[PDB]
Chains A and B, each alone.
With several copies, the nearest count.
Chain A
Amino acid sequence: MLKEGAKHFSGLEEAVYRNIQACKELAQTTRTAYGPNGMNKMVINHLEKLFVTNDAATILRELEVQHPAAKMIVMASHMQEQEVGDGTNFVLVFAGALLELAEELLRIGLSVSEVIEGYEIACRKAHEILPNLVCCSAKNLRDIDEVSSLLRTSIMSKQYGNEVFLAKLIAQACVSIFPDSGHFNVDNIRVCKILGSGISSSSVLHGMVFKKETEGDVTSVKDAKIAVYSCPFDGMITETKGTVLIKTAEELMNFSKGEENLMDAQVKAIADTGANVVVTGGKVADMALHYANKYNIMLVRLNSKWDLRRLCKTVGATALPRLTPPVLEEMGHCDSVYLSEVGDTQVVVFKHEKEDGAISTIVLRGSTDNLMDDIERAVDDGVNTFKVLTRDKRLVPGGGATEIELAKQITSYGETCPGLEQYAIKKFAEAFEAIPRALAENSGVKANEVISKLYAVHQEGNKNVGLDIEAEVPAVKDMLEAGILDTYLGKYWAIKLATNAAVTVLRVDQ
């Protein structure tokens, strides 16, 4: 410090000034990353891989900050995304916005706990009138348009353009196929992108979609005893000799000949271990394959760990290297195991669909993965934005209409409450306009226009903004009445989770 001593990278300026700005810049990024937007954010991987997303965690995961300020909070949006779909892109910016009001209060000189609680106080008050903001609920999780109305939002909350057929195809993916009664599966619902055709051509094949080539003859039976193996055939031969070819010459002709029936042995012992399909994380072996064509064992020449994972995951499979006649451990699960061509590629298909073991695997056709990825980003969320696991989600206005609703409400209360508590509770209901300011930008207007009307629309639980010309001049959309709605749930979370850190992240000056 003044001394040589201790350990801190926060405090003094940092706590007040630099953390808030560390609490700023990325929220600043997330502002048009959330909600209806035409904003787009390019990203390169550790792969150096050029990609664009308005999703945070993707961007987030590769962001390092000396402060915990930016660092620690992102778990909440994940803690959020652990719970649901998007609203995550809203989570942090909600914090960051309402935060930097406090550094102003720090300029105004308000005490931490004095700054802290009024939010927390009103954080209830949000959650308290938040149910008063339930304008609908989720009727048929089997219905497409029941669900598509929602799914459009997190996609919208991701990106504006593609939301509709997505919200359609995702319910056409049949989020229907689960009760979602507390039983819902995104292991049984997988987004598997075919590189090819269009994304409007993207389908959903219920049952496991493995774009991996269906190798040789299809499954022995459709209730497939499945041998999932990391390396089932590594080759049975070792050629090391005098020349590692021939020195005593006939000693060569043994093993290249004696290798393949060991692959037969293994493959026969694939038929002998009983696998109706064998699965190679390693390579296929052609003679073996030929034997597996004789034995008509469906095979996969090569298997991603991702493949093997879901394979090992859902089958009850265990991917193993085997230089031995194989042993079924993996066994079966899926009661129909097929070959599909979607984008006209061999699709290894596994379907047991029970409404509970029910596999509806989204199969994305498209000529670009980055395409189908930033897609799958919103598609990641929509399904798990759909995934509330309340069949009745108490649908609340989408798009951020509920914001201004409580802007009036809780600051009107924030008015009523006394003391330094006021601005704490008052700044609280001021935290909304950020995105109504943020998307108002990409919409193309100032937020006063937005907010004055978003105020002048007063209590609606409809009238709101986004990326739109409705979001421009009117400061009016239907972020309820148009079919854009939100589950009651992530609201509570998008509200609560960020409020906690914004409180908490300041309190630490270390």
Chain B
Amino acid sequence: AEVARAQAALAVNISAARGLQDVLRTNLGPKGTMKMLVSGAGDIKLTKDGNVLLHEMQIQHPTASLIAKVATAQDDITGDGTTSNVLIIGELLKQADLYISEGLHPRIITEGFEAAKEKALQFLEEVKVSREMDRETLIDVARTSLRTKVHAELADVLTEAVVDSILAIKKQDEPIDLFMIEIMEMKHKSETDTSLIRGLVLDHGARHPDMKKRVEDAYILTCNVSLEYEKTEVNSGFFYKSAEEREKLVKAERKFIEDRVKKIIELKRKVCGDSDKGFVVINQKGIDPFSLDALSKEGIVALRRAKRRNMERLTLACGGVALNSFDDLSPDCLGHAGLVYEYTLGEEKFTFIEKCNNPRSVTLLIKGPNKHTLTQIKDAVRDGLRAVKNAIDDGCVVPGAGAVEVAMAEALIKHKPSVKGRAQLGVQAFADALLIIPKVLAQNSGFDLQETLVKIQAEHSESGQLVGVDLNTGEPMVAAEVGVWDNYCVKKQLLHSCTVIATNILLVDEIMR
């Protein structure tokens, strides 16, 4: 079959690499924009996240393979640098391609990349300082982290709720949040808003007037296999088949209901006294109006529709045990929630299980009237938290906003590699690949990239002042000053995926078809 040979085998690779990469430069930093990718769903995705648009819909390329490979882990490792991980290699390549365009080995030009990344990783290790887990210190990062991920006003509006999520951690060890992400979504009258709630919240509740609003002593009966059955941990069968069967089926349900609500109410009677202490059954299916009423007059707080994953964080928050039945139970299995509350904002009834015995979780209620809003404003949350958590997860952090960028480039002293130009050339595209971070930011504003960038060097060419593109104005700033800082996980890891994939290019000297 068809074999692509030599520079033809090289071209479409670097061609589909850099060009599609060049497609993406509307973004990466608050001076970047959102980028619209409509998936097969007809969904409107306006995103500044690089990790996102790769996998969703990307013009068919063999090169579309390795790009989806690396920037995945970039969102996986850090959560940021993903919008960053795009723009490095093309610069590196466009610069490196010259040497090959000048007839030098992708082999030897590989070897300067590898050699150069060290002293930048060194520089990263050098130019970083410990940027403490203090929320305000993380704010400046969370401020800036979401910026490279998304729009400032969106990067900003989350930064409040963002670090608070990573603030409630138990000394959790993750670079990212898991349980601090509890995504509640409401159709709102404000497109961008998020309600940050500590601990788990349940998707839907069940409200009843006799049902206690805020339960400070809450013995949590997690519930399943609902009132439609009679003391069964297994869900039984139904006959709706014939219009007559539907009639004779649903009447016995009351008794099936009656059993469980009974089993429920007397379970409150054991542990809680009669109504004396608050009580909560959480019925993770619907709550039948009798038992909805009958548990309510009981003093029980009966909760409709908690998720199986809500079930999962449920018994950890109250520190209790889940039950798949409504039925009399050892009191230990009833979880004690120092707070069970249920909050109805509009249509949705948000159960607040608070004073979570494990505050492994917090809850983010995502707002928007519109999908793309509700879609996107959720997106910024998800990457940024993962990113921003690195600011708390790593006491070390490292300056963002270009401050460090021109430095390693200045310090690289490409002639210092003297061996061939195996290194000495591959370091040249390297300092170039370094500065794409100030470029696009200096780019996206007025002037040029260089016009500001050439300041940034000549500015930091006065050494020790770590200067970079002021994130929005495309003009100089010192990123160490404001605290605009990219995660120790952002900047350290990023070079790794960058150096290897552009190398993978250079190691492919042939593509058969």
Contact = CB atoms under 8 A, between A and B. Distances in A.
Q: Do any CB atoms of chain A lie under 8 A from CB atoms of chain B in the complex?
A: yes
Interface in A138-171: none
A6 B35 contact: no
B36 interface: yes
Interface in A1-54: 1-11
A75 interface: yes
B369 interface: yes
A249 interface: no
B8 interface: no
B369 A79 contact: yes
Interface residues of A, number: 29
Contact of B445 (A2, A7, A67, A111): A111
A504 B57 CA distance: 20
A112 B60 CA distance: 29
A510 interface: yes
Interface string B25-68: 00000110111111110001010000001001111110110000
Contact of B34 (A3, A66, A71, A507): A507
B31 A113 contact: yes
A187 interface: no
B472 interface: yes
A1 B31 contact: no
A2 B19 contact: yes
A68 interface: yes
B64 A6 contact: yes
A504 B189 CA distance: 17
B15 A2 contact: yes
A82 B190 CA distance: 12
Contact of B39 (A3, A9, A71, A509): A9
Contact of B61 (A5, A79, A509): A5
B23 interface: yes
B39 A508 contact: no
Contacts of A3: 12, 15-16, 19-20, 60-61, 63-64
Nearest to B376: A504
A150 to B, nearest CB: 22
B289 interface: no
Interface in A50-102: 66-68, 71-72, 75, 79, 82-83
A2 B15 CA distance: 8
Given A3-B63, A6-B57, A71-B38, A82 B189 contact: yes
Nearest to A112: B33
Interface residues of B, number: 34
A346 B458 CA distance: 88
Nearest to A117: B472
The main secondary structure of chain A at its interface with chain B is loop
A504 B58 contact: no
Contacts of A75: 369, 371
Contacts of A5: 16, 20, 57, 59-61, 63-64
Contact of B189 (A83, A114, A508): A83
B444 interface: yes
Interface string A382-417: 000000000000000000000000000000000000
Contacts of B46: 508
Given A3-B60, A9-B39, A111-B446, A507 B20 contact: no
Contacts of A10: 36
B44 A6 contact: no
A71 B42 CA distance: 13
Interface string B393-426: 0000000000000000000000000000000000
Contacts of A68: 36, 38, 44
A232 B12 CA distance: 69
A510 to B, nearest CB: 4
B128 to A, nearest CB: 30
Interface in B404-458: 444-446
A508 B35 CA distance: 4
B20 A1 contact: yes
Contacts of B57: 5-8, 510
Contacts of A11: 23
A509 to B, nearest CB: 6
Contacts of A71: 38, 44
Nearest to B371: A75
A72 B38 CA distance: 10
B400 to A, nearest CB: 17
Given A2-B15, A2-B19, A509 B33 contact: yes
Contacts of A66: 38
Nearest to A510: B35
A9 B38 contact: yes
B167 to A, nearest CB: 31
Contacts of B472: 113-114
Nearest to B16: A3
Nearest to B33: A507
Given A1-B20, A4-B61, A7-B40, A509 B35 contact: yes
Contacts of B39: 7-9, 510
Interface in A481-510: 504, 507-510
A113 B445 contact: yes
A492 to B, nearest CB: 12
Nearest to B446: A111
A61 to B, nearest CB: 15
B59 A6 contact: yes
A6 B444 contact: no
20 contacts: A2-B19, A5-B60, A6-B20, A6-B59, A6-B64, A7-B58, A8-B37, A68-B36, A68-B38, A71-B44, A75-B369, A79-B189, A79-B369, A82-B189, A111-B445, A111-B446, A113-B30, A113-B472, A508-B34, A510-B39
* The 8 residue pairs across chains A and B that have the minimum distance between CB atoms: A5-B61, A7-B57, A7-B39, A510-B35, A508-B36, A4-B60, A3-B61, A6-B57
Given A3-B16, A6-B60, A71-B38, 13 more contacts: A2-B15, A3-B19, A3-B20, A6-B64, A7-B37, A7-B40, A7-B57, A7-B59, A72-B36, A75-B369, A508-B35, A510-B37, A510-B53
